[PDB]
């Protein structure tokens, strides 16, 4: 089947680096068009990093421009997302989200687990 | 490309390959063929004529 668990989420002070991970699933990460989200306490899920199939094309929320950088890396099925120096606002829920499916059975989309992090 | 293909791509006169985008490698294996007429090469994800 089609699933993803997030990890890397932990709580950090302010300033530092965090790289969040993705475990997937039978999907292509080359394939598979890959959102990763957040939901914030007191507020609602809003998009933060979409990395694109087919060109690795990286789309960000203004909030979010400038200090986040999201990949997918083959041969070991992993979506990673970097934040370097995060605001005390980062404090949330993040989730991996697939909207597109592998090439072939095209599956439903599935939200990710998810790691809370806190920024103090 | 599999090595059975090229050993019957001897007398092959067409040949297609549909990748549905996925890399394809050829590496010096496309000269054994001579015969060939027709070369589709859908969605093979090349990214660069192969020599």
């Known amino acids: 089947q089609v699933q993803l668990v997030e990890s890397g989420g932990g709580l950090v002070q302010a300033g530092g680096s965090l790289r969040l991970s993705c475990a997937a699933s039978?999907?292509?990460?080359?394939?598979?068009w890959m959102w990763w989200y957040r939901q914030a306490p007191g507020k609602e899920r809003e998009w933060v990093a979409?990395?694109?199939?087919?060109?690795?094309?990286?789309w960000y929320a203004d909030s979010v421009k400038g200090r986040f950088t999201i990949s997918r890396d083959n041969a070991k099925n992993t979506v990673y997302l970097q934040m370097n120096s995060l605001k005390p606002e980062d404090t949330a829920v993040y989730y991996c989200?697939?909207?597109?499916?592998?090439?072939?059975?095209?599956?439903?989309?599935?939200w990710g687990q998810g790691t809370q992090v806190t920024v103090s | 490309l599999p090595q059975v293909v090229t050993d019957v791509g001897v007398h092959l006169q067409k040949l297609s390959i549909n990748n549905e985008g996925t890399k394809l490698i050829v590496l010096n294996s496309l000269k054994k063929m001579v015969n060939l007429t027709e070369l589709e090469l859908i969605r093979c994800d090349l990214e660069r004529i192969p020599h």
């Open positions: 979409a990395i694109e199939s087919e060109g690795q094309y990286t």
């Open positions: 989200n697939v909207k597109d499916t592998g090439h072939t059975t095209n599956q439903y989309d599935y």
């Open positions: 039978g999907f292509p990460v080359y394939q598979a």
